[PDB]
Each structure stands twice: as C-alpha cells, then as structure tokens.
C-alpha cells in the first residue's frame, strides 16, 4: 500500500486521538508506538476498557485491518468512537503507513 496516502488517512482520521512517535503522549486513545506485535490493552499509563483487554490479541496487519473495518464489531464495548475504514485500499494504505510510523 501507499505509506504516504496512509499518512494522510492517519492525519485526518486518527491523529486527533492517537500519536505515533515513541514516548508520545496519551490522548483520547493510547499512544500507538510498538502497537504491532503487542497485546491489546497494554500501553503503559493508559486506561483501557476491559473489553479491549479481554479481547487479548497480538496486533498484526490482518487483525488490524478487521478492527479498523468496524471497531465495535471486532471489540464490542470498545470506547474508540470510530466509524470504520470501509475501503480495503485505505486499510492497506493506513496499515502500511502505521507499520513504519510506529516502529
């Protein structure tokens, strides 16, 4: 996918609630640094819903795609108020960008 297009999608649809940089501040949602290959609900300092912790999944590019399609569907009771990326192209672009941005 296009990381630069994915950069735009993050800036307009994610940035208001999430930062990507290492040691970046918690906001509406948790910092997403090192999010891939980490268990859900494990960002230190952040207060998750227990539904997010109960889901208990190591985040990878496939479950991220499903989650971002419909967050309430993948994790019922989540407090992430996000409609969902309904275009697979945008999910591929976003995840591509997020892959490196939060390394």
């Amino acid at each position: 996918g296009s990381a630069k297009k994915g950069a735009t999608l993050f800036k307009t649809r994610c940035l208001q609630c999430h930062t990507v940089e290492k040691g970046g501040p918690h906001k509406v949602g948790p910092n997403l640094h090192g999010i891939f290959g980490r268990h859900s609900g494990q960002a230190e300092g952040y207060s998750y819903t227990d539904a997010n912790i109960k889901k208990n999944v190591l985040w990878d590019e496939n479950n991220m795609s499903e989650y971002l399609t419909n967050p309430k569907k993948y994790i019922p009771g989540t407090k992430m108020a996000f409609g969902g990326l309904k275009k697979e192209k945008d999910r591929n672009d976003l995840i591509t960008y997020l892959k490196k941005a939060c390394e």
Binding site: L9, T12, Q16, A81, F82, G83, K86, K87
Partner: protein
C-alpha cells in the same frame, strides 16, 4: 382566514419500503463519499441542513419549518446563516433525481435522520407527507440563532420552536458532529474528537476539558481547549447556566438517556408545524446499512 395549517400528505402510492430505498441511497452515498471535508464525510452537514430547514419555524403563526421545502429557493438558499449547506444540498441532488416523487422537505429532513443513524446515533422515527410550497412562502432571513450569545438568549430563542430546557440541551448534543469553518460562519475548528460518530462527547468535553475564550482569525471569540477542540459561546453557556448544567451532567453520565431524548427532540424539530391526519401511516424507523449486512 384562519391560522396557516400544514396537513401531511403521503406521496401518491409511496410507502415505507419506498422511503427505505431513499434512505439507502443517502446512506450509501454517505459511506462512499468519505473524502469530503478532510474525511469528515457529509454526515454532519446533512444533520445541520435538516436542523436549519426546520429551525425557521415560528410557533406563533406557523411560518417557516420543514414542510414547504422552501430551502430550494434562493432567498433561503443564500441566507448567511445557511452558508455551507450548499454542499448538503448538492449531495442530495443526485438522490432527488433518482426519486423525483419525494418532496423537497421530506428529502432534507430524511437526510438528517439518515446521517444521525448511519453515524451510529439513536434510531429516529420519521414521518413523510411534507409538500412543496410556493416561493413566496419562504421565510425571511434571520430566523436562525446567532453563536455569539449567552444562555438567556438560547433559552429565549428556543421558546419560538417550542423547545424546553431538556430538549435544548439534547439538541445541542448534535455539536458532537463536524466542525466550524471560517469562510462559513466566522468560526474555525472541530467541536470534538469523533467528528462523524454520534456520541455524548459534547457533554463530556464541556465538563472535562480545559477551555479558554480567545479570538480567532475572524476576530470572533470562541472557546478553545488545549486538546484542540472549539465551542461556540452559545455552546459553552450550557455550563454557565445552572438549569442547563444539571441536564449537561445528566447526559454526560448517561448516553442512553441522551440518545432517547435527542431522538424525541430531533423528530419534534423536523415535525414542527406539521399536522398529521388520522389516515397517516405510523412513523418509520429505517434499517441502517449495518443491519442490512453492509
């Protein structure tokens, strides 16, 4: 000659299944045109359009309101208060051509309901029957509220729409959606975090964020949070007024309650000035794209 009365009249040979397909067309276009306004989508502007075409109502002589579909005429179209709603109108344009039988008033109000539902808001019962009225029935400009006011102004203004304290606080929760644009209203910035998902964040943000009153690029004064949000003076006055403040805390602690009250208030808003006869069908609750499998 007797007070002006607007009798709901169902579009000839149209029923619930017909309006679901209009709903579907609106909802699908909402889903697919996701780039508008930096990926906010058309959701918020459709809600604003529905409230603006309804908010011209005057309870004292039944002038204005959603019935006549009078937004389609230039006098109401070019209302400075309505700047930006052209986008919502052009959005609904291809849908109107696909369903030319639906009245302008029915389409505008249905767009708002669809938007609220698709944005995961509460279910809003909706009634058809609005009928297009001539161009001289169009309300004069200036019937919509100003932003640089206080709670006293707000309470007083909504008397004209027959809305009480709870209904006002509920309806204002719609400012969880979308943003202000400088070239439209002289105010700039997102109201909250979730721009196109219907939540009770309006109430939570008012109470829990740190706000400061400052001048924007239009030299208008608005409340800005350190978290990057903004609120109009009329919005912030809901925590400056004691009676408003109680209801604000209520909806902030209970989204379910807020959804219930908003649904009532919004439908009331869209139906003000309308007389529904006895033969009229029961209000419609439309199926979202989500529960249709999309």
């Amino acid at each position: 000659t007797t007070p002006l009365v607007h009798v709901a009249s169902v579009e000839k040979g149209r029923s619930y299944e017909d309006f679901q397909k209009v709903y579907n067309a609106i909802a699908l276009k909402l889903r697919e045109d996701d780039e508008y306004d930096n990926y906010i989508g058309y959701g918020p502007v459709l809600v604003r359009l529905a409230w603006h075409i309804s908010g011209t109502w005057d309870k004292h002589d039944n002038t204005g309101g959603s019935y006549g579909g009078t937004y389609r005429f230039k006098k109401e179209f070019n209302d400075p208060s309505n700047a930006g709603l052209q986008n919502g109108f052009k959005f609904l344009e291809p849908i109107h051509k696909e369903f030319p039988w639906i009245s302008s008033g029915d389409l505008f109000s249905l767009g708002g309901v669809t938007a609220v539902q698709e944005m995961q808001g509460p279910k809003i019962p909706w009634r058809c029957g609005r009928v297009d009225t001539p161009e001289d029935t169009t309300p004069d400009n200036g019937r919509l509220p100003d932003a640089d006011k206080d709670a006293g102004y707000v309470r007083t203004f909504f008397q004209r729409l027959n809305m009480n304290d709870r209904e006002v606080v509920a309806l204002m929760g719609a400012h969880a959606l979308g943003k202000t644009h400088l070239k439209n209203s002289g105010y700039e910035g997102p109201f909250g975090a979730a721009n196109n998902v219907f939540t009770n964040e309006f109430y939570l943000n008012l109470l829990n964020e740190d706000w400061k009153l400052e001048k924007n690029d239009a030299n208008n004064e608005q409340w800005d949070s350190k978290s990057g949000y903004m609120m109009l003076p009329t919005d912030y006055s809901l925590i400056q007024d004691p009676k408003y403040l109680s209801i604000v805390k209520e909806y902030a602690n209970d989204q379910d309650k807020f959804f219930k009250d908003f649904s009532k208030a919004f439908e009331k808003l869209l139906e003000n000035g309308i007389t529904f006869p006895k033969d009229a069908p029961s209000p419609f609750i439309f199926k979202t794209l989500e529960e249709q499998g999309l």
